[PDB]
Amino acid sequence: AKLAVIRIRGRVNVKRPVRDTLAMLRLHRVNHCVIVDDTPSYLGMLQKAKDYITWGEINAETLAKLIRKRGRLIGNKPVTDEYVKEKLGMTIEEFAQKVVNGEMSLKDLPNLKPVFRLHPPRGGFRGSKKRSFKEGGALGYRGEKINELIERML
Amino acid sequence: VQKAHSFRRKTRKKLSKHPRRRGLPPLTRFLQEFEVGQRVHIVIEPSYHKGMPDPRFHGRTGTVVGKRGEAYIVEIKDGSKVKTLFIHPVHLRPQK
RNA sequence: AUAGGAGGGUGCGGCCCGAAAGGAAUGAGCCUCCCCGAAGGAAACCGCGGCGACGCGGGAGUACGAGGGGAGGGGACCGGGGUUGCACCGUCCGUCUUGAAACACGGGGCAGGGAGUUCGCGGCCGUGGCGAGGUUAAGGGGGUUAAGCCCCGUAGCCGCAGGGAAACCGACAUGCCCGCAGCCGGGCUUAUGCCCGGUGAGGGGCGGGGUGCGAAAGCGCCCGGAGUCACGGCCGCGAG
RNA sequence: CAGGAUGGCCUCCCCGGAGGUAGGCGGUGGGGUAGAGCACUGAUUGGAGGUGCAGGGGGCGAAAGCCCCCGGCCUCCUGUCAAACUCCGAACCCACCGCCGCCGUAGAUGGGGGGAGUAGGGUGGCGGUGUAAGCCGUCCACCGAGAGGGGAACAACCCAGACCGGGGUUAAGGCCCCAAAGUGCCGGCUAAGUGUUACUCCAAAGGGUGUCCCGGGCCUUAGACAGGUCGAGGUCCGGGGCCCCGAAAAUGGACGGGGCUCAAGCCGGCCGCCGAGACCCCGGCGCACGGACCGAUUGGUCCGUGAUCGGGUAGGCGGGCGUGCCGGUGGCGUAGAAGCCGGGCC
RNA sequence: CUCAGGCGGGUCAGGAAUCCGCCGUAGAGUGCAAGGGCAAAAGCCGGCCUGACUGGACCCGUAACAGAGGCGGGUCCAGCCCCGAAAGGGUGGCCUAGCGAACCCCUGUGCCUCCCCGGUGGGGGCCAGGGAUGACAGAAAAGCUACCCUGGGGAUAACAGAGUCGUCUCGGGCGAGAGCCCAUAUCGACCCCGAGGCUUGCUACCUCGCUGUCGGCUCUUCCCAUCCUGGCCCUGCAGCAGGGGCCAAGGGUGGGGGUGUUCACCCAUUAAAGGGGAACGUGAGCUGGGUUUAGACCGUCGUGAGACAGGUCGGAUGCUA
RNA sequence: GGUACGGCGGCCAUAGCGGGGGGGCCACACCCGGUCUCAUUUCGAACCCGGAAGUUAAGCCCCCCAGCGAUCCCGGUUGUACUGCCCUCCGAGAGGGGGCGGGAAGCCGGGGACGCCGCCGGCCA
């Protein structure tokens, strides 16, 4: 499946291994989101950097909304229905559905960058950024509940 | 008190041998052969004192770059520089 | 003359000055009206869930929103400056030090003066001339108000052949293999572009050669032509 | 040994062309730490059994010797150990391979050249030492060389890494007043102003029919305990939460202060709101890289990419501002030059 | 060929002399510390020998990563050899310690060379071995300063502050034991848990371009772990008195001898003649007896200059707020 | 192709130690004698030379065991001891704790285990 990963903690008091892991995950700043595969390598990277990120499974509807709102092309240009139809012949909803189902990867939209720069959540995070989501914080594996966070951050 | 590094410095357990492994080893390791470009581990045999590499390198994997006499030439990467060692095959092991 | 912080910072309000150099009667502060609008973003009202704080769906992505435009009214101020009031913040400057507001050192005020300079040798780089050659020193001749200007001056220095303590001997103007740029042929490709094949200056790896040690093998150094002069700059050693 | 040199770490330029590896997954190998254990070495309480074994006390002697306590050695049972022990043994770390991820033809890895500064470190976790403070190493996280928002102030703790003008939302944490946001909601506890302290920067052994609970044994609702008569739960034991005693200091005074008792304290949870230069959006500046144009020497204009550019001490590199004199070029001035006081504009 | 140690047997012979069997994973040995390695051996016993040699190449360690003179080690080529039937082994000791630059000198061995040329005596040069610097990456090397001077350091001691509380003062837990019986009227062994910062010590955090020492006099103030004064409780409290404890810091806590003394000792009174903090309160308030310069004497030590937390005599105290 | 036959080996105890039963086509042994080859720091004990009168008693070969030793699997102790990363979580302190990721040693009980492979010959066929 496809996993959405959001960086939570900042860039200070982070040791070199985790810093490099996050850099390779392309989460250079806070409130940044990426979509990755569910392969063992990526799972190991998430396990390594689990104390500064949260992640979960993303629905087709949430992926489509994220692409339409925060999806940006090279040059920080908006992703438009005209452009998506021209370069794929399908709507953003069908593109997201196919991506989630695994028919093809986001990389098949030309000039689309892998990073979504989300907005701070409405009402803030419902837990401290120093404890895992299971305990009641905001870090660690979140499951399907990451869709609510994605909605609150667009 | 600072102590300089010697050949057998702090090797009491590294160069020790199992009580049930005493005596000379089987001859297969003695008579094994390698080819240029092969990768070989370095596992020192305490009972054979000739052609022994420095225990500093015990447990590392190197590349065979030739063979002079009965000893194989193993090229290893210490830090960033390249080091050449001459090791009897009894101390070497193939990488599967 | 009831008020506390290194004497300042951000924002504005009193009082005062505002001819020129700043805007402005070809119209200032100001007042009224219309349009678009990013991130963001209500409420009235109605239905439902929770013991409760409250929340969910419609209202609605509506009202509003940085900023971007248009129209009408009025008719002389806005910008700027001095001082002071209020709200919040702010424990001076240079210095050694792990650590300076420091009960660590140097600090009454103002004006002038004040601290990587010159030569010799060596290593580099930026640029320019000539180029298997480069360059003159001392000095000489012409001309001139003059020490400027013009011409000569091969002594010398470095480079052209390296090895060796010395005696002494004394080498590729290319015999092969990879190969970047570039060029040529083909395919994909709207074009830049990508892939493949050949050739490939420069660059790299072999082969062969000179010399020292060696009985020899074999090793060290060197060999298929780029150096020299000049101006400026950085550093090294010696001179204070 | 308050000083130098060679390295490590920084900066600037060049060549050389197709790979590289801080993180992850699997695999091929190495290890002897934590823990554990007695199989080696060395310790360690008692009981049983067997051994004259050159112990030692005695009985027992012309000599040859035996009869018991006690010492030693061996086996078993029982109760304990090891930084300089190991029959075993992790987490974890290291080398090499294949792949994912990231960087690289806008030139990495790597190589040559020029210039440095650095030879007192501190806090924080771990290891050896020390009564402790501390001393000495190790980890590279923060200060040194670091803004802004908080913990009352604080170097190190929390959020957070910063070009300029604006709008919004969050972070640490906070919401009775100082002070922006709740005298917010549900169940329970404390009566001590205990507390109102994340850490920097908070006193114990022992004890409490003080209270709120959870387990277990005896009796066990007119049958239990207190005084064979009453007539409903009694009598014990081990535990959990809060509080109490144990608890004495010197200028007058510290939960930051006022103050607070179904809290404005504490335990288990929840619902709103407030709050940064962080994150999002709009406009502007510069820098890095690539591209197209014009200027007769280092220069100028515009376009494209930047989530993967914008703090900074020692130090390295680039551009620019200002002063005296000289060779040129173009000029100003007694209708008022230089200089000097106040003011406007870039 | 197999060791140490042990069991059973045997004339002298015994615990132990030399011998015969069985068991025996090394419990022996391996030149020397320790670790590692060694059983038809690397140990014990013998035969032969001198590879503990000559001319060279490359590589690892000292010195990881990451630079190095000198040195040690490893893998090899060639020459001449040793053992062995052969393979195979030999460049010292089974591996890790036992050692050292420049200049100069000595020895070996063959060559090159010395100013116009040649011979001779002698010298110079290349290669190899050797003589040492233990402060061991290599000076040739004794002291006092109180007559001292200079540049610095709070990178570093003494007084004072700060941290700590081993030590010191004080308190608590259990209760063996002593108390005619009775652990708790009184004392409280062995052991264990704490407070203070009033003794000493430890650390080296601030202060060395100066924060002027001990004691005494003067003066102000504060704490209670209370000596007297006020009020109480237990008692092995008859009274008069004693022992222990509690509340209580308003008041008092004095005068003298020797000694610089703080302190401690002593005297006569007294209700008692308590202990402590304030830069060990108080020198821009005082005094200067001691400490601690420059002069001098004695004892001891030193060859001497001289020194002594050993004595003794003398030895400066700045001020216009 | 058969063989209670040997020689050379690989892993080097799950293969060892200690026990019980069975065998001698060939073959392996014990065994007989020391002129010669060879040797005793004496010894034909070992080593060597010459053979088959006798024996399967021993070695050797085949089958069996769980007494000692070794080691493999399953269950319990047990996700116990220990440990990597984050933490404004609890403690006066020592030290503990929450989330994610690893995970023993010894002991108890039940099975396994008295070796498995390679090459070539002898005898028979």
From Swiss-Prot, chain A:
Keywords: Ribonucleoprotein, Ribosomal protein
InterPro entries, per the entry: Ribo_uL30_ferredoxin-like_sf, Ribosomal_uL30, Ribosomal_uL30_arc, Ribosomal_uL30_CS, Ribosomal_uL30_euk_arc, Ribosomal_uL30_ferredoxin-like
Gene3D superfamilies in UniProt: 1.10.15.30, Ribosomal protein L30, ferredoxin-like fold domain (3.30.1390.20)
Protein name: Large ribosomal subunit protein uL30
MF-aspect GO terms: RNA binding; structural constituent of ribosome
Assembly and oligomerization: Part of the 50S ribosomal subunit.
Gene Ontology biological process: maturation of LSU-rRNA from tricistronic rRNA transcript (SSU-rRNA, 5.8S rRNA, LSU-rRNA); translation
Top-level taxon in the UniProt lineage: Archaea
Gene Ontology cellular-component annotations: cytosolic large ribosomal subunit
Biological source species: Pyrococcus furiosus (strain ATCC 43587 / DSM 3638 / JCM 8422 / Vc1)
Gene name linked to the record: rpl30
SUPFAM superfamilies given in the database record: Ribosomal protein L30p/L7e (SSF55129)
CDD domains membership: Ribosomal_L7_archeal_euk
UniProt family annotation: Belongs to the universal ribosomal protein uL30 family.
From Swiss-Prot, chain B:
A Gene Ontology BP annotation from the UniProt entry: translation
InterPro entries: Ribosomal_eL21 (IPR001147), Ribosomal_eL21_arc (IPR022856), Ribosomal_eL21_CS (IPR018259), Ribosomal_eL21_sf (IPR036948), Translation_prot_SH3-like_sf (IPR008991)
NCBIfam families: PRK04306.1
Biased composition regions of type Basic residues, renumbered to the chain: 1-23
UniProt entry keywords in alphabetical sequence: Ribonucleoprotein, Ribosomal protein
Molecular-function GO terms, alphabetical: structural constituent of ribosome
Entries under PANTHER family matching the protein: 60S RIBOSOMAL PROTEIN L21
Residues annotated as signal peptide: none
Similarity field: Belongs to the eukaryotic ribosomal protein eL21 family.
GO cellular component: ribonucleoprotein complex; ribosome
Keyword set includes Ribosomal protein: yes
Classification via Pfam families: Ribosomal_L21e
Subunit comment: Part of the 50S ribosomal subunit.
Region (Disordered), start-end ranges: 1-24
The name this protein goes by in its record: Large ribosomal subunit protein eL21
